[PDB]
Enzyme design. Sequence first.
Site, PDB file in Angstrom:
ATOM      1  N   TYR B  66      27.231 123.196   7.127  1.00  0.00           N
ATOM      2  CA  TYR B  66      28.115 124.277   7.463  1.00  0.00           C
ATOM      3  C   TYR B  66      27.674 125.558   6.813  1.00  0.00           C
ATOM      4  CZ  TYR B  66      31.821 121.603   9.835  1.00  0.00           C
ATOM      5  OH  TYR B  66      32.567 120.837  10.735  1.00  0.00           O
ATOM      6  N   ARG B  83      42.947 116.014  28.218  1.00  0.00           N
ATOM      7  CA  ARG B  83      44.308 115.608  27.878  1.00  0.00           C
ATOM      8  C   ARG B  83      44.849 116.405  26.693  1.00  0.00           C
ATOM      9  NH1 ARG B  83      48.497 111.206  29.041  1.00  0.00           N
ATOM     10  NH2 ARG B  83      49.470 112.893  27.817  1.00  0.00           N
ATOM     11  N   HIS B 170      42.182 130.835  30.972  1.00  0.00           N
ATOM     12  CA  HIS B 170      41.170 129.951  31.543  1.00  0.00           C
ATOM     13  C   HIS B 170      41.954 128.733  31.993  1.00  0.00           C
ATOM     14  CE1 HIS B 170      37.218 128.613  32.407  1.00  0.00           C
ATOM     15  NE2 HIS B 170      37.197 127.661  31.484  1.00  0.00           N
TER      16      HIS B 170
HETATM   17  N1  LIG Z   1      35.914 128.219  27.833  1.00  0.00           N
HETATM   18  C1  LIG Z   1      35.147 127.814  28.859  1.00  0.00           C
HETATM   19  O1  LIG Z   1      34.967 128.645  29.966  1.00  0.00           O
HETATM   20  C2  LIG Z   1      34.437 126.496  28.894  1.00  0.00           C
HETATM   21  C3  LIG Z   1      33.619 126.087  29.963  1.00  0.00           C
HETATM   22  C4  LIG Z   1      32.980 124.838  29.920  1.00  0.00           C
HETATM   23  C5  LIG Z   1      33.182 124.014  28.804  1.00  0.00           C
HETATM   24  N2  LIG Z   1      33.997 124.439  27.766  1.00  0.00           N
HETATM   25  C6  LIG Z   1      34.281 123.659  26.526  1.00  0.00           C
HETATM   26  O2  LIG Z   1      33.195 123.777  25.602  1.00  0.00           O
HETATM   27  C7  LIG Z   1      33.171 122.594  24.812  1.00  0.00           C
HETATM   28  C8  LIG Z   1      31.751 121.975  24.791  1.00  0.00           C
HETATM   29  O3  LIG Z   1      30.969 121.982  25.996  1.00  0.00           O
HETATM   30  P1  LIG Z   1      29.544 121.169  26.012  1.00  0.00           P
HETATM   31  O4  LIG Z   1      29.311 120.848  27.461  1.00  0.00           O
HETATM   32  O5  LIG Z   1      28.530 121.885  25.183  1.00  0.00           O
HETATM   33  O6  LIG Z   1      30.002 119.842  25.203  1.00  0.00           O
HETATM   34  P2  LIG Z   1      29.102 118.820  24.328  1.00  0.00           P
HETATM   35  O7  LIG Z   1      29.914 117.587  24.079  1.00  0.00           O
HETATM   36  O8  LIG Z   1      27.745 118.501  25.011  1.00  0.00           O
HETATM   37  O9  LIG Z   1      29.003 119.594  22.908  1.00  0.00           O
HETATM   38  C9  LIG Z   1      30.012 119.573  21.905  1.00  0.00           C
HETATM   39  C10 LIG Z   1      29.265 119.341  20.595  1.00  0.00           C
HETATM   40  O10 LIG Z   1      30.082 119.562  19.454  1.00  0.00           O
HETATM   41  C11 LIG Z   1      29.790 118.542  18.527  1.00  0.00           C
HETATM   42  N3  LIG Z   1      30.845 118.550  17.492  1.00  0.00           N
HETATM   43  C12 LIG Z   1      32.013 117.811  17.262  1.00  0.00           C
HETATM   44  N4  LIG Z   1      32.556 118.269  16.084  1.00  0.00           N
HETATM   45  C13 LIG Z   1      31.745 119.282  15.596  1.00  0.00           C
HETATM   46  C14 LIG Z   1      31.752 120.148  14.485  1.00  0.00           C
HETATM   47  N5  LIG Z   1      32.719 120.116  13.580  1.00  0.00           N
HETATM   48  N6  LIG Z   1      30.748 121.080  14.283  1.00  0.00           N
HETATM   49  C15 LIG Z   1      29.716 121.175  15.188  1.00  0.00           C
HETATM   50  N7  LIG Z   1      29.704 120.335  16.272  1.00  0.00           N
HETATM   51  C16 LIG Z   1      30.687 119.436  16.475  1.00  0.00           C
HETATM   52  C17 LIG Z   1      29.488 117.271  19.349  1.00  0.00           C
HETATM   53  O11 LIG Z   1      28.753 116.267  18.661  1.00  0.00           O
HETATM   54  C18 LIG Z   1      28.709 117.906  20.510  1.00  0.00           C
HETATM   55  O12 LIG Z   1      27.308 117.964  20.298  1.00  0.00           O
HETATM   56  C19 LIG Z   1      34.288 121.638  25.312  1.00  0.00           C
HETATM   57  O13 LIG Z   1      35.451 121.646  24.500  1.00  0.00           O
HETATM   58  C20 LIG Z   1      34.573 122.152  26.711  1.00  0.00           C
HETATM   59  O14 LIG Z   1      35.874 121.834  27.150  1.00  0.00           O
HETATM   60  C21 LIG Z   1      34.597 125.653  27.817  1.00  0.00           C
HETATM   61  O1  LIG Z   2      34.080 124.622  33.453  1.00  0.00           O
HETATM   62  C1  LIG Z   2      35.260 124.900  33.277  1.00  0.00           C
HETATM   63  O2  LIG Z   2      35.725 125.883  33.849  1.00  0.00           O
HETATM   64  C2  LIG Z   2      36.101 124.034  32.372  1.00  0.00           C
HETATM   65  C3  LIG Z   2      37.452 124.318  32.147  1.00  0.00           C
HETATM   66  C4  LIG Z   2      38.198 123.493  31.321  1.00  0.00           C
HETATM   67  C5  LIG Z   2      39.554 123.725  31.065  1.00  0.00           C
HETATM   68  C6  LIG Z   2      40.262 122.871  30.216  1.00  0.00           C
HETATM   69  O3  LIG Z   2      41.475 123.085  29.986  1.00  0.00           O
HETATM   70  C7  LIG Z   2      39.628 121.769  29.615  1.00  0.00           C
HETATM   71  C8  LIG Z   2      38.278 121.485  29.840  1.00  0.00           C
HETATM   72  C9  LIG Z   2      37.538 122.306  30.682  1.00  0.00           C
HETATM   73  C10 LIG Z   2      36.194 122.022  30.911  1.00  0.00           C
HETATM   74  C11 LIG Z   2      35.446 122.846  31.742  1.00  0.00           C
HETATM   75  O4  LIG Z   2      34.227 122.582  31.946  1.00  0.00           O
END
Ligand SMILES: NC(=O)c1ccc[n+]([C@@H]2O[C@H](COP(=O)([O-])OP(=O)(O)OC[C@H]3O[C@@H](n4cnc5c(N)ncnc54)[C@H](O)[C@@H]3O)[C@@H](O)[C@H]2O)c1
Ligand SMILES: O=C(O)c1cc2cc(O)ccc2cc1O
Lengths: 305, 305, 305, 305
Positions: B66, B83, B170
């Site tokens: 960290y 969920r 979102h």
């Molecule tokens: N806001 C948006 O528009 C949007 C869009 C798509 C996805 N997301 C979100 O983004 C997140 C991740 O997406 P992804 O496809 O990269 O997922 P991913 O699972 O491939 O990556 C998440 C990573 O975080 C790690 N992790 C768990 N605890 C951790 C910590 N304390 N410190 C560092 N890493 C930790 C996991 O091991 C993993 O590698 C999800 O929560 C998803 O819902 C958001």
């Molecule tokens: O791609 C997106 O827009 C999206 C949006 C959301 C919204 C949410 O509430 C949970 C997880 C995802 C995961 C995702 O990949």
Amino acid sequence: APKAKIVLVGSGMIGGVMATLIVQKNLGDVVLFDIVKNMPHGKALDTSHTNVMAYSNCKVSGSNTYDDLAGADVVIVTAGFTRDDLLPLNNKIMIEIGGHIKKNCPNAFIIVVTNPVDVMVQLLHQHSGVPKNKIIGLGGVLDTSRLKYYISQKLNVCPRDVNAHIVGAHGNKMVLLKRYITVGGIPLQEFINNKLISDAELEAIFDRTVNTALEIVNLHASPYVAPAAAIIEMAESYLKDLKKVLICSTLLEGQYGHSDIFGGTPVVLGANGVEQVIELQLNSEEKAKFDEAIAETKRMKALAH
Amino acid sequence: APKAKIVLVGSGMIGGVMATLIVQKNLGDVVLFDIVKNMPHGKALDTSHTNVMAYSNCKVSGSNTYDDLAGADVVIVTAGFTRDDLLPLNNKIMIEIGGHIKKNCPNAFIIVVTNPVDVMVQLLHQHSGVPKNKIIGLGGVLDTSRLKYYISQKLNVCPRDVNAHIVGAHGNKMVLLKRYITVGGIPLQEFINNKLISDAELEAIFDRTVNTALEIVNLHASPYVAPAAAIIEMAESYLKDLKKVLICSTLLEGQYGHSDIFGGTPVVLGANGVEQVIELQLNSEEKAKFDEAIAETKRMKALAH
Amino acid sequence: APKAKIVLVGSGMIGGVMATLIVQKNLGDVVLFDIVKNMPHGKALDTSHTNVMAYSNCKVSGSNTYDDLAGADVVIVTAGFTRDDLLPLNNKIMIEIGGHIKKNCPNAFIIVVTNPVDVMVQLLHQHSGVPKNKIIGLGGVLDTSRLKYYISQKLNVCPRDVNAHIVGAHGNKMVLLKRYITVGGIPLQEFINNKLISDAELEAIFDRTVNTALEIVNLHASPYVAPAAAIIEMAESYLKDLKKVLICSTLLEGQYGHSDIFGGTPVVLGANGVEQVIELQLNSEEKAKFDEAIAETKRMKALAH
Amino acid sequence: APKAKIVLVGSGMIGGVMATLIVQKNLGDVVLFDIVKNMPHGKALDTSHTNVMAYSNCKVSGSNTYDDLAGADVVIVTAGFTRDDLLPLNNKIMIEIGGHIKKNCPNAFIIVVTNPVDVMVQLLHQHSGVPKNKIIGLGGVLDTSRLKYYISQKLNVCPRDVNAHIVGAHGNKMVLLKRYITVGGIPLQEFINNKLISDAELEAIFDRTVNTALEIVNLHASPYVAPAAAIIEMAESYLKDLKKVLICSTLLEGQYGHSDIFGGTPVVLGANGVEQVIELQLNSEEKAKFDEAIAETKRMKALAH
Ligand SMILES: NC(=O)c1ccc[n+]([C@@H]2O[C@H](COP(=O)([O-])OP(=O)(O)OC[C@H]3O[C@@H](n4cnc5c(N)ncnc54)[C@H](O)[C@@H]3O)[C@@H](O)[C@H]2O)c1
Ligand SMILES: O=C(O)c1cc2cc(O)ccc2cc1O
Ligand SMILES: NC(=O)c1ccc[n+]([C@@H]2O[C@H](COP(=O)([O-])OP(=O)(O)OC[C@H]3O[C@@H](n4cnc5c(N)ncnc54)[C@H](O)[C@@H]3O)[C@@H](O)[C@H]2O)c1
Ligand SMILES: NC(=O)c1ccc[n+]([C@@H]2O[C@H](COP(=O)([O-])OP(=O)(O)OC[C@H]3O[C@@H](n4cnc5c(N)ncnc54)[C@H](O)[C@@H]3O)[C@@H](O)[C@H]2O)c1
Ligand SMILES: NC(=O)c1ccc[n+]([C@@H]2O[C@H](COP(=O)([O-])OP(=O)(O)OC[C@H]3O[C@@H](n4cnc5c(N)ncnc54)[C@H](O)[C@@H]3O)[C@@H](O)[C@H]2O)c1
Ligand SMILES: O=C(O)c1cc2cc(O)ccc2cc1O
Ligand SMILES: O=C(O)c1cc2cc(O)ccc2cc1O
Ligand SMILES: O=C(O)c1cc2cc(O)ccc2cc1O
């Protein structure tokens, strides 16, 4: 090579900048054509070397031979002088150029810059014989870049995030549509309502926009870098098939109630050239202004035959 | 070096793509932080080499520590599961991360991705202690890229030439503003009137936009490349001082009648972070929808404390 | 459009990254072909949206239909599994693909990635029927990016300013030519003489270079982002006519004393494909090593028929 | 903003091109300083607008006030006239400028262009008072871009894939090192041996390289676009921390047996400015030539005091 051949009929100020920008973006091979002997070879030499600095591979050569137009994919015309006395004269230059385009590169995409551009573009359209979707004049893109920029600097936002529309003609009769100005997609009025920008300001900006080239001249410079960049924005949209909505001078076939003339309006430039002509749903007020712009274009057209 | 330090707290799918894109654009040094041992070092190694292909010089390293957050200029949080059972849990992860941000890089610019992002961004805001203008959540940029693209492919214009606005949250309660969609600066209605695009079409596109992530999942893929690109668009606007108008989750202090919560709205990202929060002058109809989005955000906030 | 059609026969890890990079650089339309149902449509969807963020206009679609190869300008093959037991098997996959290339896009430029690449590239050459200058295998560009990078980080210079040569084969028998390594055009020996980098160091770097993919695997990752970027560097050189000197697997017709086989050597990629095959004037020592690389390639060729 | 302030002390030909290129690449804010009234404001105006076309946000302003140097991060000096009669005179201009640099922006990175550049750079070093690693003169990058390009066009390879070294001085006494020329990392001799390029050719290219500026002048042009691009390559390496190996005029402290003078040699430009001075391990023959270059520099230094 399938590498595009871009010929610049005119290797003066705008001419050096486009060559520079085309290498910068690896858009194609460049021919700096001019009637001034040697100079184009000079500019081309200096320019050719930037290939190194730019990670590029675009040939840049000079030319005092019209027949170097052969096989050109894009042609960009800046040739000419600079009053209504120069019209029958820049008209004789468009006539000579169109002859060579028809002979050497009839399937080229053409962009006219020579002023006054809405007159001169039509002149070349008729003498070169190219299809209506294969020729436009510079105007709207340049003019709006000034409107967009000035506003952006008041609102402290990225310049490109201002959109605006100027139509009808390049020049003094250009029509600024206050109604079609947005910031980050949002109507400008909203920002007027918030007292972030006033109507008095925006009116000062409009007159600034209309008078820019003139403002630049009285500061002991000449407007050529913006013209260059905008021309290249258009050219790049043609070559890369970007389908950008760009305001250019084009053949009106009933839009805005106008026919058998070129005027400024948003078009979509891609692989087929002018792929769409977008007609703005102007109210009578803004259409009255459009009419005055088309009338000044017709007036200078007559002064050249 | 004055080279920016960009730490990716989360080196999963979105994590690999951002690293890739940051080198591509020489935006800064990258730290792929994760709690999974070694993997980040692996991705970082593979990524580091693209420096060659890209004419770039960005260090890319891994991290299971960290305290590698120290001196970070930008921090981008994707850590977490996927969920309402996962909420108190991704909340515990934001709590741990904010602790380390406050300790190691309190002046960092923060972008939250972890979902649900409007809840989770606020959570981290409170635990890290950073100023309100120094933290946003991903949402609007990604969601609108889908709305913009789908429309662009019907109208056959450059994708970027579509502008749109999605606000509030979102997720499923996101608010698509049909009223704020333009094409090349021109109101979308004009193109509806011309029978180039219908209301029925555009409504199919809206539901498509809302359901995209889900559509991607049922095709046996996962949405991570777009999320990546949008995050980087935002990050780049911070680092380069571009003042882009970008829709992000941010702290509402009275806009849309809402306070003491994060919600999606156009902001201007530059050197000071959130330099402006733009409030759309929504009618009651679109404000009713905004309200439902903020209410679902509050509801999941309670389920995590 | 004259826009190039780039088909990715294989839409796995390397497949997602190339799609991403191609849109980033507006290189052309992309088809993510795979035999896994739906997934390619998924990746393509997610990827398509980045057009917005990138100011790009590249179609990205999925495909479970070989005949989508029709009209492809570039084809990039990553399909296959991953021992010498998999050879007769990835051989059956190359055989199926070449059949479709010959049927649907015989004038396409082909880049093979499937390992082992010097074997597999020849296999596809024979079954697709394309000219020798229209097909290469990935290898040299990727391998040298590692050698170049590691050295660059010891000498604290821009990665791209290291040049190096690895030849003969991709894989364990790859030949690192210490004699052909330069920094900013200057022989590496000069920097050894100055005690800026030692022979012991450089030997540690050589073994590192040879063992990279393996180093990445034992860190719980998989090498796919660098492979992607290098493939695209090659593809871009083809499409843009850049005439880059890039080390690829190609048909030897007497170079290094070798014939009727593919092996790694600097070539020049431009509009005609392989426009030159450059033969390094190796001494006997480095030629002995080249021989061992070609021998391992022949050996795995026999194990597949 | 942390946005860099780049002041161009000289807003003539090279001056317009750099402004253009800096916006193109969003490198920083630009001040076109000149003693000619108004003109800089003019060029700046025209240039400012390209921000739109370029997706950029760089302020471009004019200036007739030295004190606008305040807070400059980079300063690029092209001011001056153009015989040995002009030396004591361009010397008076460097003296005035250094005074203002010391007063207003002592921590600026400085690049000198004014000719003769190896003399003039030292002059400014002494009067501005900046550290030795914070000031270089243009020369090597420009000169080698010509050598690299000409060769590239004979061998039909990407220009950037030629590397070369010119040292000692800018101007007629510049030293072309035939021994340090490579193509795609490979010694040029190898390509001579293959009868792809002859010694007679390469000697014609050397004289061409030495005489380029002169060749450009006799074609009724003036060399300013290449100078511009190279200056920006150097400036960008400073700002972005690229650690490029670039040949510039710098303070010799024993290299090549020379002291208490500026001369052309590969350096590494990054965040600390001149981070390394690389000394080529020249044989006596090439060192004799280096000596003649340093002697002409000393000779013109005396003619100005
Ligand atoms: N806001 C948006 O528009 C949007 C869009 C798509 C996805 N997301 C979100 O983004 C997140 C991740 O997406 P992804 O496809 O990269 O997922 P991913 O699972 O491939 O990556 C998440 C990573 O975080 C790690 N992790 C768990 N605890 C951790 C910590 N304390 N410190 C560092 N890493 C930790 C996991 O091991 C993993 O590698 C999800 O929560 C998803 O819902 C958001
Ligand atoms: O791609 C997106 O827009 C999206 C949006 C959301 C919204 C949410 O509430 C949970 C997880 C995802 C995961 C995702 O990949
Ligand atoms: N449409 C616009 O938005 C816009 C904007 C700015 C300038 N312009 C116009 O563009 C034109 C040129 O601008 P510039 O600054 O490059 O001018 P410039 O004078 O520097 O260049 C014009 C060149 O054309 C040459 N020329 C004359 N006859 C020729 C011929 N038959 N073939 C080739 N060259 C010929 C001249 O010798 C000169 O080099 C002018 O007519 C000007 O009014 C248009
Ligand atoms: N030459 C090199 O420098 C180099 C470097 C790294 C990896 N590789 C090789 O590239 C290949 C793939 O790498 P990856 O990481 O993308 O692997 P991956 O497994 O993620 O992708 C391979 C894809 O091909 C598919 N496939 C199987 N048969 C197919 C067919 N007939 N048509 C289309 N797709 C088919 C699989 O379902 C999978 O999606 C491997 O063989 C690997 O050894 C080569
Ligand atoms: N080192 C190199 O590789 C290289 C290459 C090409 C040219 N040059 C040199 O660069 C210089 C300029 O090139 P250019 O083509 O831009 O010339 P230019 O004449 O177009 O520009 C020089 C500018 O400096 C101005 N000037 C005079 N005194 C000044 C002062 N005190 N402060 C600010 N401006 C002042 C002039 O009015 C003019 O605008 C020349 O000395 C030339 O020899 C160097
Ligand atoms: O820059 C311009 O906008 C411009 C416009 C016009 C218009 C015109 O009618 C003649 C000449 C010029 C010259 C110019 O430079
Ligand atoms: O990354 C590499 O260099 C590499 C090399 C090889 C060589 C090989 O023979 C099989 C598989 C791979 C897989 C890989 O990822
Ligand atoms: O372009 C050049 O290389 C150059 C070189 C020199 C050298 C010099 O000594 C005076 C003036 C110039 C002007 C120039 O344009």
